[PDB]
Input
Amino acid sequence: GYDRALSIFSPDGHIFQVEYALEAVKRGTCAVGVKGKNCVVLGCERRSTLKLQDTRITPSKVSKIDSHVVLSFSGLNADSRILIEKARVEAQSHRLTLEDPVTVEYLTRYVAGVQQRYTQSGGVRPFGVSTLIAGFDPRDDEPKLYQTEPSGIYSSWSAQTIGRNSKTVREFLEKNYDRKEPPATVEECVKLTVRSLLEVVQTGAKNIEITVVKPDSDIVALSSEEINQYVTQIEQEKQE
Amino acid sequence: GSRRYDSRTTIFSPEGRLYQVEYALESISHAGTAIGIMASDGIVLAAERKVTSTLLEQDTSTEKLYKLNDKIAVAVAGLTADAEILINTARIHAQNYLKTYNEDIPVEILVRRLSDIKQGYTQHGGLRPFGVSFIYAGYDDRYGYQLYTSNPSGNYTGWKAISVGANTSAAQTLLQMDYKDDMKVDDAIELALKTLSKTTDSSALTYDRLEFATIRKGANDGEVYQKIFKPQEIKDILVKTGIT
Amino acid sequence: MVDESDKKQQTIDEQSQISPEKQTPNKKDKKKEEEEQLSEEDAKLKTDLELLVERLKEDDSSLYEASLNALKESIKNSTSSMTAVPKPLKFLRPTYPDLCSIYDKWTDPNLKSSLADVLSILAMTYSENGKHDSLRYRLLSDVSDFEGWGHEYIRHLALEIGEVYNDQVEKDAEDETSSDGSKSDGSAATSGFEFSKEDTLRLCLDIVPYFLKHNGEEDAVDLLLEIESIDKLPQFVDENTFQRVCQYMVACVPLLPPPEDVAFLKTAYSIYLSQNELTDAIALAVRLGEEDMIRSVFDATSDPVMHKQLAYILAAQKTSFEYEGVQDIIGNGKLSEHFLYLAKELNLTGPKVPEDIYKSHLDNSKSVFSSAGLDSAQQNLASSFVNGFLNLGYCNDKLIVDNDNWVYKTKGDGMTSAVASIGSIYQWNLDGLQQLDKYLYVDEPEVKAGALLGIGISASGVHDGEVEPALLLLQDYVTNPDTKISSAAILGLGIAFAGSKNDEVLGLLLPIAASTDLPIETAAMASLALAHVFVGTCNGDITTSIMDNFLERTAIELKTDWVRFLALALGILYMGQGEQVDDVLETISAIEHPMTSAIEVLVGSCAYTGTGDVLLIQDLLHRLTPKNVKGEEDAEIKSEEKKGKSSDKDATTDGKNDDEEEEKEAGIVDELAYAVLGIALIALGEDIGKEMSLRHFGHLMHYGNEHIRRMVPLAMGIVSVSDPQMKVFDTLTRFSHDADLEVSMNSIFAMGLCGAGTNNARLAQLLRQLASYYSREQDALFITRLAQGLLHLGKGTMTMDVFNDAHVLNKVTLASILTTAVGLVSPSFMLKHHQLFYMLNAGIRPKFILALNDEGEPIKVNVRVGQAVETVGQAGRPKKITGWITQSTPVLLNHGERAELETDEY
Amino acid sequence: AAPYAAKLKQT
Amino acid sequence: TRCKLKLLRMERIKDHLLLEEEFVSNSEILKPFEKKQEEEKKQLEEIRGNPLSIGTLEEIIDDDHAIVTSPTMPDYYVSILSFVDKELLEPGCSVLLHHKTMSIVGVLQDDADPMVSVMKMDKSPTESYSDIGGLESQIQEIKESVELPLTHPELYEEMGIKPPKGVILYGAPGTGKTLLAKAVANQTSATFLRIVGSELIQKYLGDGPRLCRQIFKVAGENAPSIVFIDEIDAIGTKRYDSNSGGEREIQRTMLELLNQLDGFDDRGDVKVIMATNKIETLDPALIRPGRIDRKILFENPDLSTKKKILGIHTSKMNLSEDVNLETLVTTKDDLSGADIQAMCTEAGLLALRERRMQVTAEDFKQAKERVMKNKVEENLEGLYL
Ligand SMILES: [Mg+2]
Output
């Protein structure tokens, strides 16, 4: 149909290539962000069911853009490699010219700008990745959560999920989290993200990856034994 | 669905899964088998040749195996025509990096950059994806011996052992079944020869149908020594392993 | 193989690939050859037993076919072994499973029949020692878990089922029945049944009622009784076992004859009483009707909690629902003695709270002054009456009634029916008495009779509130000798106090007016008045009524109609049990007339109830005989002939109904299926059967309380627009009425429009219009169903006005009686202890038509409703408790029961 | 089990 | 189980009783031959010499003559003589004519054709409701369109909304679509007509359009009804090509049914069940809602659905109580309900090769491997890239 054109504006008002991007986000891993008062917890699936895989050199889904800016993603791994690279360069650009450390909010916009640009320029596909960019603003200790979409726009939610079986996760996020009050403690906040991920992973120590990002360049990924500890405690409740 | 659209990379399939990429899989698999086994004491690269004519000189062609630099070698499977652009760029890029920092290229770097051109041709430019898979065999001191594979799509995944091109599934079922976790380098050669004889039409696995190289950390005083074995040393070791 | 070197234990191993066949010459040839070798076989007996366990680890047909070749022949007396009386006896134990294996598991018919006998002896003889008990036990308890035991244990018990079936099949019974050739009762077989049953309550749900029903005796439930009482809490929880009991009893009970039919109910009742749940138990107390039993359960409910809480409320409400009201009076005195509150309990046991809940409901359904009916001629009479029928239950229609114009504008006997129907506006409630009292003093004799009948209809909302007694009004008019006035009034007494027994009711009715002194038809109503009283509980089968039936019948038989009134009345009186109705069946049968035999069939229909075995067949030999007399001819005196023929047709449907109500719910679909094919058969058979059968067919549909309410009522109605008789519309439509604005939405448009159109007699018009309007209820205003309360197949008490009058020719005098239609249906409200009206949530499943619900276990899917809802016949009936949000447990556990909800809310 | 098989066959 | 036994006992005493009654009742001696019957009989033999060659009444002229076409190319201007009322006969009726001289001796036909009998398949639905392991939610969309006006006309009447016309079933085979069709059929107890759409694809001249008209007539006569036009797409969007004589037929049949589905107005008393695989990637020929109303897409079975289906099957099996049910369904991806059905059947087959009469504890974990591998090959889903 109109899938062969981008320039052609379409009376449907909807260019099919754009629709098809969404199909692509769905297929990918589930990646979730839930934020406290002092933390972003990012719980994400990393598949590891692959036989004869040396896990050490296989890239973790989470990639440090900046020293305090992180990215998780759902959608095609190849296409996603371009966003990570543009975004890294721009990170260091920011410091080189403003001196100021990376404004996260600029960065959210910069990234979306690329998925937008390519919607207008024929002969350049719109990317079929949606991302989570999360960070902490210069001179600030309030957590910051953003999602980008392949529609070439951006938005902030109090907590959000993307990728396979996101429908299932969204019910959890409505009932156990609230915009009004995020779980004040870091600890509360991490335990709920583990329970959400369990709904679609259905038991895995390394299939669940938790990276907690705190203010002031504090990045630490939870220990496999500690992750295992969240699971067992939760699993006792399930039969009660 | 019905009307399959795929003229350009930019034009999406209804499915959303670009058919040009799909056709790329077929092509890879067209070519014979290549196999990389990473061992704790070397890497072994062993493959059955594409060519089969005796008139055509199989012996002087190591179509599968080219070295890019002193530490890094690649096994190639797919489209010969397309492939030739990428092997050449990869050598120059490696030497560009050595110019800059006066250190050997890290394995991980060299793959990620090449994968990114492969994406480049779908991201922009009608230009077909250059549908080729390499198995990279390299060494760096960041992670030791490292093995990678690259998808035509333009993404990579590490592996403990992998097979590419034709009959990937059969060779894969055997490797995992008898896998020895530690892996000795002597062992890897034996194990490789067993897998190829079962997937190779000649079940006597003639030498003239074989390409072989071994990259060894088990080379004196703890160093990395790449050695391309000629058809005459393949033949001597064929009689050592006893298939003939 | 069979070799006399395969005896060794050396060859266990070499053989065992193929199948162990070491056993085969070891119990065959050794037994025969030497009797020193029976003692040797005893030492080898230990090995041989373990081989059986190995051949049940892998269950396959090959290793049973192959193992046995002559293990089948040799048992004891085959090999002529009997030596040391102990040895061959112990050698019965290994060869017993052997036979069971080749009978079934490898499929073979011949061996099933032939070895059925052999096998049962072996089990009986050795269970006396109690060492067959021990062979059974090791596979029953599965210490070693395998496929083998699961089919082996079924076999052992299959044979026991065989043994008790010998009692049922032949009078010879016992040993002499050689299908088994092993007695049903001994000193070795009995000790086997019990032991098996305990273990198998745990392992199976369905082998246990198999033994019960084929025995066809209460001997089967006595052994069970003691077992269930051991197994009730420890083996499995009180609630789960309680479920097992309710299944078991309903499967065995329809089959059995009248003296034992009742016995299965006494055993079940007693189990239920013992277990904590008495919700089911109160039900069983209604069915027998023994005063003794209602006292026992009722006290058992009240005694655990010495404060009102859930306990007293539960007791009261269970009794209330049954609007027989017999139970209510029994329950008050226990409650009144404690005196937590006197008044609230009396009200709540009594029917006063049922009046009050409806008042709340009306507001919702919307109070209407709506009337239907047309002016001029015999419709001028109708329109008045019809306002009554349309304003079913308690409703405001005060202002319409307040006009005296409409009432005096009625003519004739129609004036009588007008004042009675004003009572039907105010049905189920005292309030609206005042309008009626006015009529009672003023003008015509006709309206005085009408006033009294209507006061009856209204005062039904009491019988144990004892707030404005019926007796206060109704005494005075008995004394006035005018026949019309007295008749309305002494029938009235019957309706208002209903089923309830009270000193007041007996002493009013002790004088009867039924005599030859008033030839008048309306004197018959004394005996009819009596009939209300007795029903809903065990009958005295009072002799007073028998004496007066006979007197009047013989004396005047010129009027058939007089004596038909008397006959059906005795019939109604009898409902509720059959046992004592058998006894008085003889009294009537001693005197014989063509007239007597109208009575024989009717009272017989009640009498033979307690089995379908006799009842169903009998009322079909009777249906056959008319056809036969006529077909022969083809190839005072008048009054006798007419009665005979009409009663026979009536009795045929009535018997079917008695059967279905008492027996399981599978029997309802089934009787109905006979019934429909049956129409074609009776239409073929005769002209007279064609007309009459229609009239009863709509009554079959309603009394039977049919599941299906879709295709069949509509088939029948369409077909009888053309066919003579329009009294079929009346009877049918009261079935169509029980699910309001559904079956009846159809009814109104089709019948009410066409009836007006094709009009060619106003009398017919009246019949059609009255049924079609009645059937509808304005926006689901109260419905009249057969259900008495927890019974939904309950013996009718004030809805048998349809039974009386469908039978007899239509009349202007009938129109008065027909205003009675009392038996309204309670909403379903969650209650705790504060009586907060309306339900929180409950499940109803409105998709029922299934004939494979017979347990009484709700279809637990439902669709959830939050609004209070009336219980809709067979379209709404299944009821689940839903109140889990605030975390609750049923204290009243629904079984599709009409009953309001009760829960313990945490 | 078996005596109730033959009830189906008759039906 | 037991519930079924209780019913057998009643069904076998109903039949017996009926059969015996029947002799007398039908007659065997009753032999009505009194004045009313005798009249009919005497006359009927006299007037009717046989065979009787049927006609079609084309028109009436009031003078007790009619014009009929006989099967012979010459038509015949006939007298109306005897029996059938003049009024009762309306043009377009098929009629009995007497062979010696053609006269209207009556009607007993009403344009009886064998085609109507073939279509007529009210016969015992194999499904009762909720024998199926399907989900409450899917069946309670079909039920809402079809059942709910017949059972409760009160709500529809009160709202004032019209009763819906038609549904479309489409899935996904192995969602038990035709099972669903016969679940619905049982409940309604409506005259359940069935016709398959390939009988309307023929080279034969104009026969398709003739068949299309028949269907509307049949349903109306035997109303209330459900008309299963099964593989509606056979006529419609689905092909039989036009370089096979199809440049005549297929056009005429498609149009014809289309025109009658709208009609002068929707009938609103003939329910339809339209089967088709899906009309998502096929062209749509089922022409907009209001004549097909609610359209029903059955979900591909998720993990909770197949639990319910699975419970039916495990009942007969012995040694599957130790086997953990929950883990077999989870491990497999979400797939057809047909694939769980396939598994049960394979499972038993496989036990027999091991030599165990019914499944072993081991047999069930093994069963899953053979069925999953076969089915994933048969139907391959897009590989994540
Ligand atoms: Mg099908």
Notes: The first strand of chain E starts at residue 52 and ends at 61. The two ends of chain E are 51 Å apart (CA to CA). Residues E 177-178 surround magnesium ion (CB under 6 Å). The interface with chain D takes residues 5, 8-9, 11-12 of chain E (CB under 8 Å).
